[PDB]
């Protein structure tokens, strides 16, 4: 219970006290108190995982496996730790051991499926979830059905040229989510899945109504906040969207999720907050500097900022000189991206077009530097006049 | 393995005493609100538009 409340410090004391007592009680019924010692040792290992003392957690799980090799849950946590270390190969091996022990275990099959989906290995992953739905005891398993629905949903994020194929995939995803919601009227993810397909179909009002109901039911699904924020951007309610992306980042991610930070940058850009957009994209680029899309968006925001400073004659010499330097940075990045940019995420012709537009603006920007120098010198003259008039009085 | 397979009865004993409240099914469920009636009505409205009615 203390663990469920996050009172890991108290939980450590209670699990240790439980083990020490079971150690004392084994003198009366060694077989039962040893069984208690197994469950309590597993709980203690989960506590060490929650405290991130993963070396002790791994050590306890391996001890349990020395004594009770059929205790499947120890294998799954070892695999989960391997997965979280990013060592998906070892993780798949730990889950396979779990399946060698209980071949129809639904969580082991699901963890392997999630490994394949995390790798975007849609074919193998789908086969792993279908293996769960083929057994009579789990033929209506909502987690597996939702996972298959998500497999279809993930195809919708790719820019698909075949509108009929896109419609067929949308209808498959929606049919699966409808069935899950028919089987389980309380299923949060079935409802969110329906909302996601409706949003992809462009029915943003209806999708908003679905996601709004899901957020009413639970505050702890990160994707529900992202989906709502996306709808706010599409409904041009940028001020609300920016707030939802920032609060989502602060509440659900212990690190900067670059996709969410990019969505925040997109909202700030449509909001016209180019300075905040620039700073947000730089924050994303600091985490993922090799991502050419972040570099492109930075170059674009720099070009827009320079364009604005150069377009408005109110801009002074310090501002215009900074804008010129930023526009040369923009031209430099677009020239590089036109050669090395990721063809699968954006069109290189776009970067080549911006590169040319930057050179075109740079020509006019040099003229504006002279204009700014003249304007600043005129202010210097006015200031000198003001000082001498103060001496006159 | 012959030494592994011999000890499955012990683990079955342990598991009979364990109780887990959050499972693969309950982790997906809302604390009390039912969405089916509301969402199917929304989908019916969308379906009517797709059929041009």
């Amino acid at each position: 219970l203390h663990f469920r409340l996050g009172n890991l410090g108290e939980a450590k004391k209670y699990f240790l006290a439980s083990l020490d007592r079971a150690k004392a009680e084994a003198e009366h019924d060694e077989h039962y108190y040893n069984a208690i010692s197994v469950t309590t040792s597993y709980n203690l290992a989960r506590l060490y995982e929650a405290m991130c003392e993963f070396h002790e957690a791994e050590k306890l799980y391996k001890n349990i496996l020395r004594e009770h090799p059929n205790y499947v849950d120890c294998y799954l946590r070892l695999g989960a730790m391997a997965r979280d270390k990013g060592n998906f190969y070892e993780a798949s091996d730990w889950f396979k051991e779990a399946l060698q022990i209980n071949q129809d275990h639904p969580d082991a099959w699901s963890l392997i499926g999630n490994l394949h989906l995390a790798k975007q290995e849609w074919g193998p992953g789908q086969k792993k979830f279908e293996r769960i739905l083929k057994q009579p005891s789990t033929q209506s398993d909502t987690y597996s059905m939702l996972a298959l629905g998500n497999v279809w949903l993930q195809t919708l994020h790719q820019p698909t040229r075949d509108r009929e194929k896109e419609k067929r995939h949308q209808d498959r995803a929606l049919a699966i989510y409808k069935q899950v919601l028919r089987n389980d009227a309380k299923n949060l993810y079935a409802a969110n899945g329906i909302g996601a397909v409706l949003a992809h179909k462009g029915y943003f009002r209806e999708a908003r109504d679905v996601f709004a109901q899901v957020r009413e039911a639970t505050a702890d699904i990160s994707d529900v906040w992202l989906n709502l924020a996306h709808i706010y951007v599409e409904q041009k309610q940028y001020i609300s969207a920016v707030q939802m992306y920032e609060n989502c980042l602060r509440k659900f991610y212990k690190h900067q999720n670059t996709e969410v930070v990019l969505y925040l940058a997109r909202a700030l850009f449509k909001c016209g907050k180019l300075q905040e957009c620039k700073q947000t994209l730089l924050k994303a680029r600091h985490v993922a500097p090799s991502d050419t899309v972040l570099m492109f968006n930075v170059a674009l925001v720099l070009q827009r900022l320079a364009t604005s400073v150069l377009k408005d004659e109110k801009s002074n010499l310090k501002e215009v000189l900074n804008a010129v330097k930023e526009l040369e940075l923009a031209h430099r990045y677009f020239s590089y991206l036109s050669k090395v940019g990721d063809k699968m995420r954006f069109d290189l012709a776009l970067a080549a077009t911006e590169a040319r537009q930057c050179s075109d603006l740079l020509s006019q920007a040099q003229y504006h530097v002279a204009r700014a120098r003249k304007q600043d010198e005129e202010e210097r003259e006015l200031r000198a006049k003001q000082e001498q008039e103060k001496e006159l009085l | 393995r012959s030494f592994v397979d011999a000890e499955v009865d012990v683990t079955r004993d342990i598991v009979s005493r364990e109780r887990v409240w959050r499972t693969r099914t309950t982790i997906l469920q809302s604390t009390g609100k039912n969405f089916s009636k509301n969402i199917f009505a929304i989908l019916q409205s969308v379906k009517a538009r797709e059929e041009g009615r």
Binding site: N43, A80, N150, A196, H200, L226, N297 | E18, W21
Partner: peptide, 27 residues
């Protein structure tokens, strides 16, 4: 007419399922 170049960002409506809950076991 050349569409004004927007921020290169594909909006993805996600439905990521939660990790399987291995909560501490009650006795």
């Amino acid at each position: 007419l050349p569409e004004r170049s927007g921020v290169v960002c594909r909006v993805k409506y996600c439905n990521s399922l939660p990790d399987i809950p291995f909560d501490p076991k009650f006795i």
